[PDB]
Design a protein around this ligand. Structure first.
Ligand SMILES: [Zn+2]
Lengths: 8, 439, 452
């Protein structure tokens, strides 16, 4: 299952 | 027993899931904002804002938040995605309200000192420069740009260096005013958490939040559906040792009826690494081909991104810039999709996929944090939470036929966008791919 | 143990069966054997690893392929791993599959085929794994630390098998090892989210008729010795900054020792490292990380086992600073008890306590972590300490406590079963001369112990 592009 | 739900008079949704035998919990505020809620000159704000919320508020100085959280042993974190902005905390149960307090404080009553807003512009650039070293991240940013041509979803989260150097304290305050509305946020909790008490604290620390003048239930359509634009963007770069390609087709959305079926087809194609294999006891024809006579690539990976109103579904390839003919690997991948379309897939591999999928979606909801992540995202982008039990049913009922139909609907006579980075010289273009795929 | 819903019983053959917590979205289970590298001696060196890499391959009743595909169909969320003191097979599965998973774990634990081919593969693969491991300092330094701390015995017996000893690992030695440690009385079957009555049923079905081989008891108590070792500077790769490393520690405490909670607080208080809550207000951050930038990493460690442990500080820095390394650490240690103007404060101790509590409780939020912790506790002192009790002991901690413990450790005044020495263990990477007279600087600060 592909992750959700996030930026921290 | 399940996920409890309550709404505040300003629209704010309080979604909880109690966990027996626990003494800590995670609480998070999820907002339907993100970078898809910015514009061309705006692009980059939501993320910038996020960095700043940790620099001080109308009640607590930067270092005051830090020391407060650390003394009770809690944790504060946040991220920004194209669809949302999220701030959340982990802490012992005694500190649940104290956390809901600080969360609202940082999210709304933030100082946004101009001095800070300037020192930050450099941190955000350094950040940006690191992402450019993560080719997969790069390749996917471009893919979004040409696939959602001149649309919100098409812009990156970090934003252009340009905007990072030109964001004004007013941009920030406006993004806040414009976006932060009760009917556009979900406060999610899981662990040692009393639903009723948390609904109270919610009112007390989030009641003061503006309601939208034209409220829409969390799930209902933003406005104009994003549209998938076939395109290609080759990025020559003879220095790179490896070439990175991404090939996508209009996918599926969070609430789509075929959501899991798409994820099931992704699982059937699967991944492969030239060194490790497939991580499956039995490799697919594609996986086998990929590795025969010298290897056709370093690695390939199926992907399926979702949004409330759209989706991307495809393959991500990685080749040796000096050894592989990218066209050879693309053919086998297309050949594998055609195989699914033609029905030549076994009951056994369908079951493996359903099983892979089931474990990936449910066994992984272990900690209160992982669970909050699920409650939060599901509600703030869909308006509800499918319980583990429900998700299990959705996957378990998928059939060989279900997959074959899905494959034929989405991978036949439909547009494909693509992006290549590195030794672009051996990569076929979009009309080639579509010809072979649809052939 | 109280509102854990923790139940513990035994089968006639000695297998302890333990369950905790109540039905949930899925379950977790696993077999825990009391083995590991600390029992390999010189004869079985390398066996614990090969056996664990050999898990879930073909067995007397299940074909290699069938084993694999069935584990795939159960979500494939399982693993076998081992350490200096444990060997475990765990997995989390959907509630209705507990029995099938348990049956499979049984087959691999009781009837492994270990065919010539399965073994050849693992050995070959083992060589490559050893080659990679020797390049990651994060792994090599602690390895060097244990070997030095116990003069290569028990807890010091090599956890990373010597590359040249892998080829001589034969099926015979593997079988010898299984015959000494794979016995029901040396095992624990534990479940989480499974009814004790159901667990007993399944356990007896698949592990009931298992019988001991009645092997020679050969578990030696760990004897801490202290010592020094230094390996060459790592190769200068690309743009990466060249660093030297050093770890200094003393004998610590056994995990079920009474002052263990205090010592863990001391560890949290020193903190260190390289959003908020990340422990940036810990002494090592404050007094070292923020005062020197020739120091790229500095953290406090606490290795704790069944009958001994190692407590100390790790420090990575620029080759140029090497000469100051020992002193910087010695000072920090000294400042936890010996310096009257830096006594541990109420604030420091309280924040530490809360962080300790937090990290534990938050980690126990995982069924798999709950599982492993329960399995190992039962395996060690046959009872699972209830969370209530744990949290309590930490909260009752007062500054003087942390101070007493700190002083005890850093003075070489710990008295464990092995009756260990009070010498310090100093292991380092980089040029030896660069670190200076380590013992002198340590004695200077009254650290360690020289008499009996
Ligand atoms: Zn950032």
């Amino acid at each position: 299952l592909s992750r959700v592009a996030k930026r921290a | 027993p399940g996920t409890r739900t309550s709404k505040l008079p300003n629209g704010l949704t309080i979604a909880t899931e109690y966990i027996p035998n626990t003494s800590s919990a995670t609480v998070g505020i999820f907002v339907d904002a993100g970078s898809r809620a910015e514009n061309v000159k705006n692009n980059g704000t939501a993320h910038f804002l996020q960095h700043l919320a940790f620099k001080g508020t109308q009640n607590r100085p930067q270092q005051g938040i830090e020391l407060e959280i650390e003394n009770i042993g809690s944790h504060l974190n946040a991220y920004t995605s194209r669809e949302n902005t999220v701030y959340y905390a982990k802490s012992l149960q005694e500190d649940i309200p104290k956390a809901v307090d600080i969360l609202s404080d940082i999210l709304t009553k933030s100082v946004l000192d101009n001095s800070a807003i300037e020192r930050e512009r450099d941190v955000i650039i350094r950040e940006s420069e690191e992402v450019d070293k993560m080719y997969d991240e790069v390749v996917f940013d471009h893919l979004h740009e040409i696939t959602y041509k001149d649309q919100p979803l098409g812009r990156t989260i970090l934003g252009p260096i340009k905007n990072i150097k030109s964001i004004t304290r007013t941009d920030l305050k406006d993004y806040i005013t414009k976006n932060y509305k009760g009917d556009r946020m979900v406060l999610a909790g899981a662990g040692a958490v009393d639903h009723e008490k948390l609904v109270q604290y919610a009112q007390k620390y989030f009641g003061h939040v503006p309601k939208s003048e034209s409220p829409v239930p969390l799930g209902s359509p933003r406005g104009p559906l994003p549209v998938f634009c076939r395109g290609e963007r080759f990025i020559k770069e003879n220095t790179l040792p490896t070439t990175h390609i991404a090939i996508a087709l209009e996918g599926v959305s969070w609430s789509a009826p075929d959501y899991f079926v798409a994820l099931a087809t992704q699982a059937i194609v699967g991944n492969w690494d030239r060194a490790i294999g497939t991580g499956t006891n039995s490799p697919s024809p594609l996986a086998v081909a990929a590795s025969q006579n010298g290897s056709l690539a370093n690695s390939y990976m199926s992907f399926s991104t979702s949004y409330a109103d759209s989706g991307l579904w495809g393959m991500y390839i990685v080749t040796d810039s000096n050894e592989h003919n990218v066209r050879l690997i693309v053919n086998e991948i297309l050949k594998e999709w055609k195989r699914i379309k033609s029905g030549k897939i076994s009951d056994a591999e369908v079951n493996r996929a359903k099983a892979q999928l089931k474990a990936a979606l449910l066994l992984s909801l272990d900690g209160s944090t992982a669970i909050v992540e699920d409650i939060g995202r599901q509600v703030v982008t869909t308006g509800k939470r499918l319980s583990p039990e429900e998700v299990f049913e959705q996957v378990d009922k998928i059939t060989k036929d279900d997959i074959i139909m899905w494959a034929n609907y989405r991978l036949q006579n439909k547009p494909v966008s693509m992006v290549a980075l590195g030794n672009t010289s051996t990569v076929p273009n979009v009309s080639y791919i579509e010809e072979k795929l649809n052939q | 143990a109280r509102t854990d819903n923790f139940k513990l019983s035994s089968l006639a053959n000695g297998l302890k069966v333990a369950t905790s917590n109540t039905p949930g979205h899925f379950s977790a289970l696993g077999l825990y054997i009391d083995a590991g590298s600390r029992f390999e001696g010189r004869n079985l060196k390398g066996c614990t690893h090969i056996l664990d890499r050999l898990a879930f391959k073909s067995t007397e009743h299940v074909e290699g392929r069938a084993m694999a595909e069935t584990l795939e169909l159960l979500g494939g969320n399982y693993q076998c791993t081992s350490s200096r003191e444990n060997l475990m097979y765990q997995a989390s599965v959907f509630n209705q599959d507990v029995g099938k998973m348990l049956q499979l774990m049984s087959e691999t634990v009781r009837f492994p085929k270990i065919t010539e081919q399965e073994l050849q593969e693992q050995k070959l693969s083992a060589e490559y794994e050893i080659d990679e491991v020797w390049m990651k300092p994060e792994l090599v330094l602690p390895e060097l630390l244990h070997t030095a701390a116990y003069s290569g015995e028990t807890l010091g017996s090599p956890l990373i098998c010597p590359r040249g000893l892998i080829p001589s690992i034969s099926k015979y030695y593997l079988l010898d090892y299984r015959n000494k440690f794979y016995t029901p009385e040396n095992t624990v079957a534990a479940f989480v989210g499974v009814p004790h009555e159901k667990a007993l049923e399944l356990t007896g079905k698949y592990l009931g008729d298992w019988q001991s081989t009645h092997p020679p008891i050969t578990k030696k108590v760990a004897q801490y010795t202290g010592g020094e070792s230094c390996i060459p500077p790592a190769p200068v790769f690309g743009n990466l900054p060249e660093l030297f490393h050093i770890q200094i520690g003393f004998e610590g405490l056994p995990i079920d020792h009474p002052d263990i909670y205090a010592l863990a607080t001391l560890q949290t208080l020193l903190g260190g490292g390289g959003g908020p809550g990340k422990g940036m207000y810990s002494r090592l951050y404050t007094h070292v990380l923020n005062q020197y930038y020739f120091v790229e990493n500095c953290v406090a460690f606490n290795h704790s086992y069944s009958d001994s442990g190692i407590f100390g500080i790790s420090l990575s820095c620029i080759p140029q600073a090497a000469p100051q390394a020992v002193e910087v650490i010695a000072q920090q240690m000294y400042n936890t008890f010996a310096n009257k103007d830096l006594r541990l404060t109420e604030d420091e101790v309280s924040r530490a306590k809360n962080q300790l509590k937090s990290s534990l409780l938050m980690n126990l939020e995982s069924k798999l972590v709950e599982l492993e912790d329960m399995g190992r506790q039962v395996l060690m002192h046959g009872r699972k300490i209830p969370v209530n009790e744990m949290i309590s002991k930490i909260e009752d901690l007062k500054p003087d406590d942390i101070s007493r413990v700190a002083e005890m450790i850093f003075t070489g005044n710990v008295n464990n079963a092995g009756n260990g020495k009070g010498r310090a263990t100093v292991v380092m990477q980089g040029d030896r001369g660069s670190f200076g007279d380590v013992e002198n600087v340590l004695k200077a600060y009254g650290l360690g112990n020289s008499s009996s």
